[PDB]
Amino acid sequence: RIFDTFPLQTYAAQTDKDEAVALEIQRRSYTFTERGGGSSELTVEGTYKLGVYNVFLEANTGAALATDPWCLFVQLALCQKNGLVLPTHSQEQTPSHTCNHEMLVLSRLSNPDEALPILVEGYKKRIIRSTVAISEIMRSRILDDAEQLMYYTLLDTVLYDCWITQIIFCASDAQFMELYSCQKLSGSIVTPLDVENSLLQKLSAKSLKISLTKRNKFQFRHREIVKSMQGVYHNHHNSVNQEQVLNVLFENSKQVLLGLKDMLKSDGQPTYLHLKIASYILCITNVKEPIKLKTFVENECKELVQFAQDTLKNFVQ
C-alpha cells in the first residue's frame, strides 16, 4: 500500500573497505597468465579461484606449485585445459591487477567438508565446487578407456595411502605443518611473535591431521589407525599393529612405482595419468626429512624424477 514509500532516502552502498585485509589476499594469491604473451579477455564473472593448502617454489624452474598431490594435479589439469602458464610469485610482487584466473591459499576450514582443493567460480553468481565434485569431474574424463581407469584408481588408493600414512606418522610436526597449513613460519625464535606461532603449531598440529584423514575415504579404508589418533594412551598394543599396517603399504607401493617405470612415454600431450604420476613425484621430492618413500624414489627411481621434470616444462613458459 503506502508502506512502500519507505525509506524516504536511500544512498549508494557503503564504499569503505579495509586495507589490512586487501593486503592479506595479495600475499596469498598467484595469478595464472596466458600462454601467448600476455592478454586478457575475461570478465570478473568468468574467472575462478583454486583453493590450495600451501605453495612451494620449485628449485629448477622456479614456478609456484601446490604442496599436496591432489592440489597439484588439479592445478596442472586446469593449466592444460585453459592454456595457462604456471605462476612465479605472489601478487605482492605486482601490485597492479587485471582479470585473470588465480590460485589462493586457504585454510582447511573454508568449507563444510574440511578438505581442499575447491573451485570458486564467478563474482556475483558464485559457485563452489568441493573436493568430491572436483574428483568426480576429473574422473569422468577418462571413463572412455577401461585400462587407464584401472591405473588411475591404483594411484589414488595404494600410493595415496602410502603417502598419507608416511606424512602423518613418520614425519615431524615441523614438516607436516609446512605442507598442510597456511600459517606463517620464520625458523628463528627472536621476536615475541615467533613464540606465539610455534606454540600455535604445537597446539593445532594434531587437529589438522584428523581433518586430512577424511578426504578420500581414508577413515573408512583404514578405520583402526584413525581411531588411535583420537585418544591419549600411546600403548604398545596399538603401536605394534600400526607398524604392521605401515609396512604392508610401503611394500605394496614399491611395486606400483617399479611397474610405472615401464610406461612413461608420452606421444604428445600428457594424459590425466601422466599428470597424476608427475604430481606425486614432484610433491615427494619436496620433503626435507628423509622419509622412506623419498629415499626410494631418489635412489631406485631416477627415471621418474626426470619424467616429472619433463612434463613440467610444458607449462612454464
Binding site: E147, M150, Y151, T153, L154, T157, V158, Q255, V256, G259, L260, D262
Partner: peptide
C-alpha cells in the same frame, strides 16, 4: 613380469569398487 601392474590394478579395482 611384463603385465604384472595390470593384474594388480584389476585385483585392486575389484576389491575397492565391486
Amino acid at each position: 613380469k611384463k603385465d604384472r601392474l595390470l593384474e594388480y590394478s584389476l585385483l585392486n579395482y575389484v576389491d575397492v569398487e565391486i
